[PDB]
Every structure is written in C-alpha cells, then in structure tokens.
C-alpha cells in the first residue's frame, strides 16, 4: 500500500489569501524531515465551513486513500472553531489519548492549552489528527504524538511509515 | 457587564443543614483576584438534575453571565449529576479543564480520578465545575483561572482580568 | 453484601488474566471471590458478559483486559460504555498517563471505566507492565468508589496499595 498523507489547513483568512499558510508549511516540512519511508502529500486549504471540512476529510481518506491526515486550525473555544466536531463526524473510533497528550505538552508552554479541543480518530485505514496553528507548537506537538502514529496506522491497515530514529522514534 | 454566576449544588446546603463554605470560598476567591468590575449571581440549589439545568440556563440566558462556577455533585454516586446537567446545557465542551483539574487534584487526593468535573460553553458563557472542599476549590481555580478570561474573550463574553501577583490571566499580545 | 470481582479476558494460556487475578489476591485483604471469563472480540458477547457479571453474579468490580486498541475489532470500550450508565473520565486519563512513561503508543489505548448499578467496570491493557502501572494508579480509589455506588466492602494491604476512605 502506498503512503499518502493529507495536510488540511482550516482557516477563512488563509483560504481567502489574506495571509500565507505557514502552518501547513510547517507540517509538510516536518514530515519531509522525519519520515524515512516514501510518501506522497495531499495538501488542502479550506475556510472553516463545517460541511467543507467533513467533505474534505472524507475525500482524502476515501478517494485519495490517505493513511494519515493532519489538520491545522479551528480547534479553540470560539463557536466557528468546528474542526474537532467535523473530525468526530467522519470517524468511527476516537483516540482520547491524543488530545490528552497534546494538551499536556502545550501546557508546558502556556496555561491556555486547556482551551484546545484538538482530538484524533480513525476512519477506515486512515488516522486523522488535529494539530495546533503555530509552527513551533506544531513541531512540539508532532514530536510528542508522531512516535505512536506509524504503529497506529499499522493497526488499522494503513500504509507503512517509519521515521528517522535520530529525529523522532516511531515506537513499535 | 461582567456577571459571574456561582451555583452551589447541595441538598444539605439548600435545606440549611450546612453553611455554604464552598460557595463562599468561590466568591471570596473571585473578589480577591479579579481587578475588573463584576457582579455575582449566587444560587444554592438541591441536586435535582432538572433544576440544575434550569438554573445554569437562567444565569447564562437571562442574567447574562459570562462565567458560571458550580460546586458540588461531581462524584461517582448516582445523585451527582452536575456534569450531566452541564453537558446538557452546553453546546461545546472543553476536555482540558476536567483533565487539568483532576491532574492537580490527585497529587494530594488519590480519589481525584473519581471526579467527573467538566467545563463547556453555552453561548457567550463559560461553565466550569469545581469541587466542594474550599481547599480543592482554590487549587482548581489557581490552575484553570489563568485560561478563563481569554476563553471568555474568544466566545464573545465580558472582559475580566486578574491581579498578576495572584493569578496571571494569559492573553496573546501583538 | 458479598464481594465478588469479575475478571474478563477479551481475545479471539492467559497471562494477562492471570496477572490481574494474582494482583487482586496479592493486594486485597478482605474476603472476596473471583468470577473469571474469557470471551472473543464480539461487542454483543462482551456486553452480555459484563451484564451477567454485574447483574447475575453481583460483581462490585469488573476488570477487563484486551480489545482496547485502535483496530476495528477492539470493541471493549464500546461494550463498556453500552452497559454503564455513568462514565469516569479520570480513569482512562490516569491510566494512559502512567502507561505513557515506557509505552509511547499508550495514547492509542481507548481504555475507560464506568458504573453499572453498584458495579465499577475498568478496562485494563494487555501487557503485564501496563496492567501493573494501571492498577497501582487506580486501585487506591477503587474501594472508595465502590462504597459510593453501594457495592461490597473491599480493602487492601496498606503496604502494597492504600485504599483511600
């Protein structure tokens, strides 16, 4: 099975071109830097429209065959922040451990980490994980959860992915 | 106008069996650390799920509270339905609150994992479940209060700020 | 008033189940009986088993092992949620936390805990190392939780794990 990783930036302003997407860039740069195995990327930038988020996640998993989808944006307390809701809506099983750890890690930086509603779940053979917005926060987040990602994908029947032990160790 | 609701959910407190030291502890905490004008909507009710839901809704919808702090009814016993009532009236929950509150509470109380305290949003009002003991109330508040004012900003609620020497309310600055 | 504890191994020798039984026998100092069940990874059968133990055998505590991962057939958490009327988020939170110390993949665990009548049900992992850290972390609050839901009296050896009360 070929590894295809989805990167979805959820932001009205970003989708309107009001500002450049440094978040999606940070995610792709991180993946290219740590993943040893071969893989393709399916990048998407969309406004925070609930239906568009769900339709986009489903397209990447079902039609593009992504084994992993990383989202960035729309995970705070504000009413328009519906990325977690969209994620739950397309997944059959949620993984509470992801949200717990990502908040734990963020707490080391700022107390507002408890306002994050980022989560993760499974849709078929695809793992979907909600990431933060800031490039630095994205890096710290992935260093924390990436070690468990390749194995999780193995368990749901997704493509094989491995990372550079000197960068981040994919625990198996 | 900043209006903060304080709801004590206790059958015995509502009947006049015990003095509400919990509610009093919360009000004293608020007055001690908040450095902006605010009014309090204090309520003491028995642990009746329907009444809890009606009270939270009234304080949020009619009294215009931007923050509601509850105390009591968050344990494993069948009658403790504060979390259930809170989830029922909120449109969006915030798992980080319950997570951190249980985390800072166990280093002292091993039964902290039995607490079902949570927090959520109803319109422009943040609702947070606190423990009963005045000691635990201060610990929980010192842990989550730093994020409360900003969370309220984000949901369109009233402006609240705290004495940085007591509690630092973190807010991103340009 | 009799203390009965259920131990359910969920998987299509039972090291994991043995570990739990040994733990219970080692730390509990009060009289109690164990109802042991080994069943396949079928949600309905898991649900019926938990109900049989809680309702018919009168268990005050049920500890499960297996079926808590991300795979499609790991449905223990779903079955547990289905039979309980009140869930305890604090359990899964702490168990994943202590487990994460050696197992990075601990965040893939969907273990939880809930209450069905006067019975507390807790999902444990499959590996002995994880089962131990998990029990050492939550057992201190189990006897008291059982008291609060009206279950049987259980107490532990203070030199192994102190049950708060």
From TrEMBL, chain C:
It catalyses: molybdopterin + ATP + H(+) = adenylyl-molybdopterin + diphosphate. Pathway: Cofactor biosynthesis; molybdopterin biosynthesis. One of its GO terms (biological process) is Mo-molybdopterin cofactor biosynthetic process. Its EC number is 2.7.7.75. InterPro entries: MoaB/Mog-like_dom_sf, MoaB/Mog_dom, MoCF_biosynth_CS, MPT_Adenylyltrnsfr/MoaC-Rel. Catalyzes the adenylation of molybdopterin as part of the biosynthesis of the molybdenum-cofactor. PROSITE patterns: MOCF_BIOSYNTHESIS_1. It is an enzyme of class 2 (transferase). CDD domains: MogA_MoaB (cd00886). Belongs to the MoaB/Mog family. One of its GO terms (cellular component) is cytosol. Residues 6-145 form the MoaB/Mog domain. The gene is mog. Keywords: ATP-binding, Molybdenum cofactor biosynthesis, Nucleotide-binding, Transferase. One of its GO terms (molecular function) is ATP binding. Gene3D superfamilies: MoaB/Mog-like domain (3.40.980.10). It comes from the Bacteria. This is Molybdopterin adenylyltransferase. It comes from Aquifex aeolicus (strain VF5).
